[PDB]
Design a protein around this ligand. Structure first.
Ligand SMILES: OC[C@H]1O[C@@](CO)(OC[C@H]2O[C@@](CO)(OC[C@H]3O[C@@](CO)(OC[C@H]4O[C@](O)(CO)[C@@H](O)[C@@H]4O)[C@@H](O)[C@@H]3O)[C@@H](O)[C@@H]2O)[C@@H](O)[C@@H]1O
Ligand SMILES: OC[C@H]1O[C@@](CO)(OC[C@H]2O[C@@](CO)(OC[C@H]3O[C@@](CO)(OC[C@H]4O[C@](O)(CO)[C@@H](O)[C@@H]4O)[C@@H](O)[C@@H]3O)[C@@H](O)[C@@H]2O)[C@@H](O)[C@@H]1O
Ligand code: MG
Ligand code: MG
Lengths: 924, 924
C-alpha cells in the first residue's frame, strides 16, 4: 500500500532488509531501490552517503529522512533499524513536497513497529559474525623492494650501490647488454646505532585483524481496542578489521498510542534513546601503511616502536599510530521523541497536533601522546582535547484534514502549518604538558602547559504552510494538487518566503470497461506528475558579511592559520598580543530559494493474478537559482566567497523494477526481484569563478558547464615508448624517453603542452542493477542478492603508487607488487612504464592511465536458513524458532581493465570486509 | 498497605501532596512525615535538604531515594512529581536495608503511576500562581540612615559634621545635656563630578518582583489483561521573587508492562526524560542589597549603573549584579530509565532481572561583563566560561523469590545480587578579552585573551549480596531476618566487604483470642526491630595519598590559590613556568564501613471501625566507626586531612502519628491528621583535631564531644550598661562603657576573657508538629495544613547588622529600621545597645544576644475547591471537572523573642514568598 498512489514511490521489503544483518537499514538497501545510490566505505559504523535521482544540486545532497512523521537529516547508523515495519522512498518532488520543505534531494519514510490490535508478541534476535579482510593490497617485500630499486637505478643509468639504504647488489650484464640482477644483501641494522634491525614486515597484516560483530535485539508488542504499545531493546557491537577501531550502540525504543472518548480522541508517542561509543581509524591509515616500506620493523631493538632511520622515507608507524589512537573514543547520545494528539469532531474531520524533538549530545576526549619513531617525532608533545557538542531540533505540526465520499467522488482536503527550529553548539578545551601520559591522568586540570578554549554556536528556523487536495473519480481518475509556502531564517525579509506548486494525474487503464476480456492483465496504471520544490541547505550565516576575531588559537597545517595576532611592539611574545578581525565572507541580501522542477512519468503493471508486477519510470529534474558559494575572483582576497543563485542542474533518468513470485508443483516458492536504473547529469549554468577554479569538475582547465558533474579533464596516454624510434616519431614533449608514457597530441601542433587535454573522466555509470532471489522449500529459506554497476569510470589513486616508482610527494616509498611487471628490454610484453627515480616525463599529471573501468557485480548478501517445524515449536511452546547462516560481500566479479581490487572502494579509504554471520530468531 | 508490615514505615497520601502544587514532591511533605526535617530556602527550584531521624553521621546525610526500584541520591526538583501514585518512607534500618546498601540515612520509596487494569483514563491539570515577597527586611532610608549616623557620632563624642558623607546636621543640646537632632540636609550629588545624585532608593523593592508560576500536566493511562501503559507530559515554570532568576522544566514519562506466556513471563519498563533550564541568584544577593545604603541611586546621571563614590562603602549594585547575572543560564538533561524482566517457573518461584540507568547532562555558559559602579570596577574584565558535566549511573539487580503457604505458616525467602557503577566527569573552557560584550558574541572562539582549560573525572562501584526471610504464623506472629554483604571500590581489598544483619519481630494483639469482646479496638500491633546498616558516603579517592599538579589556573579569592608555578629564572613570566605537585590528602588503607545500629519499637492502633488510627514509635540510632575526614594537626601542613573511623553518633527519638476521619449528619466529612516528633542528638567520640578545630560545633573553644551536633559555645549577654555605676560594679572588661553589652563572668575571676564562654546554641527543636484538616461538604473540599516547630534556637546574622552600628567588615553600611530604637539617655527603655562607630567592646563575638527563639507555626498550604456535580460532568461527557484556589505560606505566627522575620529562614538566603494559586483539573 503506497501512501501517495500517484507518484514515484518505492516500497522496500523490510524482511529482506533485516536478513543482511546490517546496523544501518539504509546501508542494507544499497541497490534495492531504483534511482538510489548508497556508498559505504566499510567502517564499523553504518555511515553511508545517499544520492537520490543523481546529483540535483550543488549544495548538500543528503536526503530528508522521516521517522514517525518527524523529519531529520542525521545518519541512521546511530539509530536502531531492526524495529522498522515499513520503508517508503519518495523520489518525486510532487509526492515528497507535502512531507516537508527539505524534499529537494528526496524523502525517505521510515515507520517504526507498533503493537498489532488483538495480539501480543515478542521477538528475540541474536547474531554473531566474523569479518575478514579481503582487499589486502599487495605490496613489495624487502627482496621485491630491493629488486624494484635496483631496476629503477639501472634504468636511470645510476649506480644501484649508491642507494645508501643498506642494499648491496651483485649484478652484471647479459649478452644483449641489458642489466641483470644476480643477488642482493642487506645490512643487519638500518642505522649506525644498531637500534633498528632489518626485517620483513607485512604492514597490512600487522594493522588488520579479524573483527567480531555481535547483535542482540529483544522487542515486545501488545495491541488492544483501547490502545497499543511496543518496547524494544537493542545492542550492537562491531570491531573493525583495522586494529583499535570499534563501534557499539545501545538502543531503547518505546512506542504507544491510546484511544479515548469513543475513538474521538487519540494520543500517541514514539520515543527512542541511543548511545553509540566509537573509536575511529586515523585519517589516511591505509595510505600510511602502504607508504611505509616493509624493511622497517614493528619494534626496535629496545622494544620501542619502530621507525625509519637514516635515508628511509619519513613515514610514521601505522601500528604505533593505531595504538596511540585507541584512546580517541567518542560517545554520542541520540534522543528522538515525538508526541501527537488527534481529534475527530465528526466522521470526516481530523485535527492533529504533533511535537517532535531530536537532541544529540557528543562528548570526545582526544589524546596526543609523545612519540619517537626513529627520525619521526613530535618533540615530546603530549596534549588533551575535551570536546562537547550539542544539537537540538524541535518541530511543531498542526494538520487539519477533511474527507468526503459523495457519490462516486472521493475528496480529501488537508491543510498544515509546520514550524522547525534547530540550534547547534560546541565547545572544547585544550591542555598540554602531561607527565604520566595515560588516559586516567590526562585531564585538563592535571595539565601544566598552555590551555586553549574553542566555542561556537549557530542555528536556523523554518516555517511552512502547505495544502493538499486529492480527488478520485470512479476509483479510476486520480488528481492531486499541492501548494507550499516556505520561509527560512537564512534569507532576508524580502526573499524570506517562496511558493511551490505540484500537480499529479493518474489513470487506471485496467478499470476501463473496454478491456474486460484482458483477464491476464490484472492491473495497469499510467501516472504523471509535475512539481516544484525549494532548496535552502546552505550556511546559516550566508547573507551576512562575516568578520571574525581569529586570534590564531586553532591548529593549522603548514602555518596558514590566517590568524589575527601580531607582535607590533617586537618583544618576541611573552603576553597577549594585540588582535583584530578578518573577513570570512561577503554577505548577499538577494539570495532566495533554489527551485527544483521535477517531471515524472510512471507505468505500473501487474499480470497473472498479481504474480508478475513491475513499474517503469522516467524522470526529468531541472534545478535553477541554485545557491552556490562562489569563490573570490582572485584580487578580492579573503572573504571573497559569497552565495549566489547562479546554478543550473539537469538530470534525465530511467528506472525499471520487476517482480515475479510463484510456487512449484513439488513445493518450492521462488520470488525474483529485478531492478535497473540509469541517469544522465548535466550542468547548464555556473558562476565564472566556480568554473575557473573547477571545484565541480574540469580540474581548473576547462569549464564544466555543458558536461556531467564531477567530470575531469586530463591527458590521453597512447601507450608507452618501446624504442628510441617511437620517441623520435612522436611529437616532442618534456621528459620523453624509452619506457615513458606517450601523450596524444589532440590539437596536432607538434608539441605536448597544457592545451593537450580533454574530458577523460565521467563519474556516471551506464546502468546500476540488482537482483534478489528468495527460495522456500521444506522449511529452508535461501536469500541471494546481487548488485552490479556497469559503465562507470573510476580514478585510481592506488595506481599512482603501484604502476610507478617515485611518483609520490617523497621517494623510496613502498609500492605495489605489480610494479615488478614493468616494461624493460628483458620483458617487452608489458604496458606498465619502465621504472625511474626522476619524474622527468611528469607522469603524475591527470591522464587516461589512471582512469579504469569501475564496472562490477558482487553478491551483497547470501543467507541460508532453517525454520523449526510448527509442531516442534508448539511442543516447546515457541511460536517461531529459526536459525540462519549468511555471507556478506563474499564474492565479486570485476572487469579485466581494473588493475586494482574492490571496485566499489578503489581508494585508500576504509576497506570492505567479508562477513560470515550465524544468527537465531526466537518468537516466545 | 505497607511494603514491610514490621518496621517503621511512613505512608504519604499523594492526594494531599499534589494539593499544595509544589514542583518538588519532597518539599510538599515538609512536615507530613514524623522524624523527617525538610529545609527549603525558597528558590524557584524545588531543591531542599532532607534529614531523616536527625543527624546520624558526620558525612553526607542525603537519604537514598528509590523510584521504580532504582536507587539514587539526586534531588527530586529535576523530576516530575505529579505522576506519583504512592510514597513510602523507610526510617528503620531493618526495613530499609533490603532496598540498598546506602540506607544509613533512610530510604524513600517513590512509585510512579501505572495503567490500572480494565480501564483507560486521562487527567489534565492547569495551574497559575502569583508569588509575592513577604519577608521584606526593613532597612533605613536616607533620613533614617542620617539620623542613625548622627546618633552614633554624638554617642561616640565625635563631631557629626565630620562624617564627610554630604550630611549637614543642625542639632543642639536639651536641658539635661543629651544631644538632640533638629534637622539634616544633604548635598545634591555625592561626588565632585556631579554624576551620582542623592536619592531614596528601596533596594529590596528594586531587586524584588511578583513572580509568576505556571504548571501544565497531561497524563494518560490504559490497562489490559495482557499489559498496561502510561504516558505523561508535564511543563513547569517558576519566576523567582528576586529579579533575573527563574527555573523551568519539561518532563516526559513513559511506563509500560507486558505479560506473555500465560502470565509466566513479564517485561516492564519505566522511563522519564527531564529538561530543566535555570538562572540562579548570585551568592549573597540579599546581603549585598541590605549592605548598600539607600542613598545610592539605581542609575547615574548619564544613565549608567549607579555605584558608591567618595567615602561611601564599597558595595556593588544589586540591581546591576542581577542584570549582569541574567545570562548565567544552565541547562540540565535528566535520564531516568529502568527495564525489568520477571519469570515464574512455577506458582511460588519468581526471578527478576532489572537494569536501571541514570544519565545527567549539565551545560552552562557563565559571562563576566565589565562593570564600573562608581569606585567599584573590575578593570574592564570580560570573560566567558563554558562548562559541561556528565553523570552516569547504571545498576543491575538479580532477585530470586520463593513463597510458601503451608498450613498456617507463610514463608517468603528472597535472595539478591546488586551491582552499581557511577562515573562522573566535567570539563570547562575559559576565554577573555571580548569587545561586543553580548551573549551572542561571547564565545571562546571569539575571544582574544588568555584561555584556560579545566577537567576532572571520578567514579565508584558497589556490590551487594542480600537475603531476606519472612515467616508468618496464624497471621499473628511475624518474623523477619535479613543479611547483607556489601563491598565498595572506595576501600582496600582487605576491608572491602562488610556484613550487616537485621531482625524484626511483630505481634498482632488484636488477633489474640483473649480480647474478642473488645469490639472498639479494631486492630493493635506491637513491633520491634534491631538492624545494622553500612555507610560509605565519602570521597572516592579516600584511601590514596593524593598528589596533584595544581599549576594555578583556578580562580581563587585572596590569592591563596596554593598553585605550583614559580618563576625560578626570574624573568617576570612570559611563558610556561616550571611546575610540580602538591599533596592534597594522606591516604589510609585501614578505612572500613561505618556501622549504624538502629533499634525501633512501634505500636500501631486502629479503633472505632478503622476510623481513629495511629502509631507511636521510639527509635535509638548508634553510629560507630564513622568515616570522618580529620584535618592536619597543624604542623603536618597541607594534605594532613585523612579519613578515619573515629566517630560516634547517638540519636534518641519519639514519633506519634494520629488520624481521625468521620462523616456528619448533615453531610460533612472531616479528616484530621496530626503528627508530632522529637529527637535528641549526641556526639560520643571524635578525633582530637576535629574537636579542636570545631567543624562540628564548639567554635574551636570547647570539644563538642558529649553535646549535640552543631551546638555553639559563646558568651552570655546580661543586658547592657545603663549607667557608669553599673560599669564600675561589673567585672572589668575591654571596651566596657555606657550602653555597651555586659558579659557574664562564668568563672567569677573578676575579668572577662576567652574563658568566659559556655554552650549557648543548641540546634535541636523541642518538638516538630503538623496538622492536616480536610473538609468535604456539598462538592466543596477545603484543605488546611499547619506546620509548627517548638523549642529551637537560631543564630541570627541579620541581627548582627540590625542591632548594631558598624558591626560588619566595613563601616557606614545600611542597617535595619529597629536600629533606630537603640538605648540612649533620651530613650532609656530599650535593650538594643547604644550606637557607636568603634567596636571597642567587641560585640561581634558569639554570644546569647544573637541567639533567638526559632519556634514558629505557619499555614503551609490552604486550598478551597469546587467539584462539578456528576450530572453536569456527564452532560459535558467529562468524567471529572474541578477548580481550586490555594494559598501557600499565607500566614505564620512567631515568638515575641524573635526580633527578625521568617523564623524558618532567618538568614540572608533566598526568601520564602506567599503563593496565590488558581488551578483546574479535567478528567476527559
Ligand atoms: O573534519 C572532517 C572529518 O572529521 C569528521 C569526524 O570524524 O567530521 C568532524 C565533525 O563532524 C561532526 C558534525 O556533525 O559529526 C561527524 C561525526 O560525528 C557522527 C556521529 O554519529 O555523525 C554525527 C552526525 O552528523 C553527520 O555526520 C552529518 O550529517 C551525520 O552522518 C551524523 O548523523 C559521525 O557519523 C561522524 O563521524 C562532528 O561530530 C565532528 O566534529 C568526519 O565527519 C570527517 O571525516
Ligand atoms: O559552590 C557551592 C554553591 O554553588 C552550587 C551551585 O549553585 O554548587 C556548585 C556545584 O554544585 C553542582 C555539583 O553537583 O551542582 C549543584 C547545582 O547544580 C544542580 C542542577 O540541577 O544540581 C545538580 C545535581 O547535583 C546536586 O546538586 C547534588 O546531588 C543535586 O541536587 C542535583 O541533582 C542544582 O540543583 C544545583 O544548584 C555543580 O552543578 C556546581 O558546579 C550550589 O550547590 C551551592 O550552593
Ligand atoms: Mg598539442
Ligand atoms: Mg572570667
Amino acid at each position: 500500500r503506497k501512501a501517495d498512489l500517484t507518484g514515484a514511490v518505492s516500497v522496500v521489503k523490510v524482511d529482506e532488509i533485516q536478513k543482511q544483518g546490517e546496523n544501518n537499514p539504509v546501508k542494507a538497501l544499497q541497490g534495492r531501490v531504483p534511482g538510489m545510490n548508497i556508498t559505504a566505505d566499510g567502517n564499523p559504523s553504518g555511515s553511508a552517503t545517499v544520492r537520490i535521482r543523481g546529483i540535483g544540486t550543488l549544495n548538500n545532497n543528503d536526503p530528508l529522512y522521516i521517522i514517525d512523521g518527524v523529519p531529520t537529516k542525521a545518519g541512521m547508523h546511530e539509530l536502531n533499524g531492526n524495529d522498522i515495519e515499513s520503508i517508503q522512498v519518495l523520489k518525486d518532488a510532487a509526492s515528497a513536497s507535502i512531507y516537508g520543505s527539505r524534499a529537494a534531494n528526496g524523502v525517505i519514510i521510515i515507520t517504526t513497529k507498533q503493537g498489532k490490535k488483538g495480539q501480543i508478541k515478542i521477538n528475540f534476535d541474536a547474531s554473531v559474525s566474523a569479518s575478514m579482510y579481503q582487499s589486502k593490497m599487495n605490496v613489495l617485500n624487502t627482496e621485491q623492494y630491493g629488486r624494484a630499486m635496483w631496476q629503477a637505478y639501472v634504468n636511470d643509468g645510476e649506480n644501484p650501490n649508491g642507494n645508501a639504504l643498506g642494499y648491496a647488489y651483485n649484478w652484471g650484464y647479459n649478452a644483449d647488454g641489458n642489466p641483470v640482477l644476480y643477488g642482493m644483501t642487506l645490512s643487519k641494522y638500518l642505522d649506525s646505532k644498531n637500534t633498528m634491525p632489518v626485517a620483513d614486515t607485512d604492514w597490512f597484516d600487522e594493522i588488520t585483524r579479524t573483527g567480531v560483530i555481535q547483535q542482540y535485539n529483544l522487542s515486545v508488542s501488545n495491541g488492544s481496542e483501547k490502545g497499543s504499545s511496543f518496547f524494544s531493546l537493542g545492542y550492537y557491537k562491531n570491531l573493525g578489521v583495522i586494529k583499535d577501531t570499534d563501534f557499539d550502540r545501545f538502543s531503547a525504543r518505546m512506542n504507544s498510542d491510546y484511544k479515548l472518548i469513543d475513538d474521538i480522541l487519540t494520543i500517541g508517542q514514539h520515543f527512542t534513546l541511543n548511545r553509540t561509543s566509537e573509536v575511529q581509524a586515523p585519517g589516511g591509515i591505509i595510505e600510511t601503511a602502504l607508504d611505509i616500506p616493509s624493511a622497517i620493523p614493528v619494534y626496535a631493538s629496545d622494544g620501542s616502536w619502530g621507525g625509519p632511520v637514516g635515508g628511509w622515507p619519513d613515514r610514521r608507524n601505522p601500528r604505533a599510530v593505531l595504538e596511540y589512537n585507541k584512546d580517541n573514543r567518542y560517545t554520542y547520545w541520540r534522543m528522538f521523541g515525538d508526541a501527537y494528539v488527534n481529534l475527530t469532531p465528526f466522521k470526516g474531520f481530523n485535527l492533529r497536533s504533533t511535537f517532535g524533538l531530536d537532541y544529540a549530545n557528543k562528548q570526545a576526549r582526544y589524546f596526543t601522546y609523545p612519540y619517537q619513531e626513529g627520525t619521526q617525532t613530535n618533540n615530546g608533545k603530549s596534549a588533551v582535547e575535551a570536546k562537547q557538542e550539542h544539537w537540538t531540533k524541535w518541530m511543531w505540526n498542526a494538520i487539519a484534514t477533511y474527507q468526503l465520499e459523495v457519490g462516486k467522488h472521493r475528496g480529501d482536503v488537508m491543510i498544515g502549518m509546520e514550524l522547525n527550529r534547530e540550534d547547534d553548539s560546541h565547545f572544547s578545551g585544550y591542555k598540554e604538558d602531561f607527565s604520566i601520559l595515560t588516559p586516567d591522568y590526562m585531564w585538563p586540570d592535571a595539565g601544566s602547559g598552555t590551555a586553549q578554549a574553542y566555542g561556537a554556536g549557530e542555528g536556523y528556523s523554518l516555517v511552512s504552510f502547505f495544502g493538499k487536495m486529492n480527488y478520485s473519480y470512479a476509483d479510476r481518475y486520480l488528481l492531486s494538487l499541492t501548494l507550499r509556502r516556505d520561509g527560512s531564517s537564512r534569507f532576508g525579509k524580502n526573499h524570506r518566503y517562496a511558493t511551490f506548486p505540484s500537480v499529479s494525474l493518474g489513470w487506471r487503464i485496467t478499470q476501463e470497461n473496454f478491456m474486460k476480456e484482458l483477464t491476464w492483465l490484472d492491473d495497469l496504471k499510467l501516472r504523471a506528475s509535475w512539481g516544484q520544490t525549494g532548496n535552502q541547505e546552505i550556511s546559516n550565516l550566508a547573507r551576512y558579511t562575516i568578520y571574525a576575531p581569529n586570534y590564531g588559537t586553532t591548529d593549522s597545517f603548514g602555518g596558514q592559520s590566517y590568524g589575527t595576532a601580531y607582535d607590533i611592539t617586537g618583544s618576541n611574545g611573552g603576553g597577549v598580543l594585540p588582535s583584530g578581525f578578518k573577513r570570512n565572507q561577503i554577505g548577499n541580501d538577494n539570495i532566495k530559494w533554489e527551485t527544483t522542477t521535477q517531471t515524472n512519468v510512471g507505468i505500473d503493471f501487474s499480470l497473472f493474478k498479481q504474480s508478475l508486477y513491475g513499474s517503469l519510470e522516467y524522470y526529468y529534474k531541472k534545478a535553477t537559482d541554485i545557491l552556490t558559494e562562489m569563490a573570490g575572483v582572485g584580487v578580492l582576497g579573503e572573504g571573497g566567497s559569497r552565495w549566489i543563485n547562479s546554478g543550473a542542474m539537469k538530470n534525465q533518468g530511467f528506472e525499471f523494477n520487476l517482480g515475479y513470485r510463484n510456487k512449484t508443483a513439488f513445493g518450492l516458492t521462488y520470488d525474483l526481484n529485478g531492478n535497473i536504473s540509469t541517469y544522465r547529469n548535466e550542468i547548464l549554468e555556473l558562476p565564472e569563478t566556480v568554473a575557473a577554479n573547477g571545484k565541480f569538475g574540469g580540474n581548473g582547465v576547462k569549464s564544466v558547464v555543458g558536461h556531467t558533474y564531477g567530470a575531469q579533464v586530463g591527458y590521453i596516454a597512447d601507450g608507452i615508448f618501446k624504442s628510441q624510434d617511437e620517441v623520435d616519431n612522436h611529437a616532442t614533449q618534456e621528459g620523453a624517453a624509452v619506457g615513458r608514457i606517450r601523450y596524444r597530441d589532440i590539437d596536432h601542433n607538434g608539441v605536448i603542452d597544457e592545451r593537450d587535454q580533454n574530458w577523460i573522466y565521467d563519474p556516471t555509470p551506464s546502468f546500476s542493477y540488482g537482483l534478489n532471489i528468495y527460495l522456500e522449500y521444506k522449511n529452508f529459506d535461501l536469500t541471494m542478492f546481487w548488485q552490479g554497476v556497469q559503465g562507470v569510470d573510476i580514478i585510481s589513486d592506488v595506481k599512482k603508487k603501484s604502476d610507478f616508482w617515485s611518483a609520490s610527494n617523497v621517494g623510496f616509498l613502498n609500492k605495489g607488487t605489480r610494479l615488478l611487471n614493468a616494461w624493460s628490454p628483458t620483458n617487452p610484453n608489458s604496458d606498465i612504464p619502465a621504472l625511474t627515480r626522476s619524474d622527468t616525463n611528469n607522469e603524475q599529471r591527470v591522464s587516461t592511465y589512471f582512469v579504469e573501468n569501475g564496472s562490477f557485480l558482487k553478491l551483497r548478501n547470501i543467507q541460508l536458513g532453517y525454520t523449526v517445524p510448527a509442531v516442534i515449536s508448539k511442543k516447546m511452546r515457541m511460536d517461531r524458532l529459526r536459525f540462519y547462516c549468511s555471507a556478506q560481500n563474499l564474492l565479486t566479479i570485476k572487469s579485466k581493465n581494473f588493475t586494482g581490487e574492490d571496485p566499489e572502494n578503489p581508494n585508500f579509504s576504509y576497506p570492505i570486509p567479508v562477513n560470515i554471520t550465524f544468527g537465531l530468531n526466537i518468537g516466545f
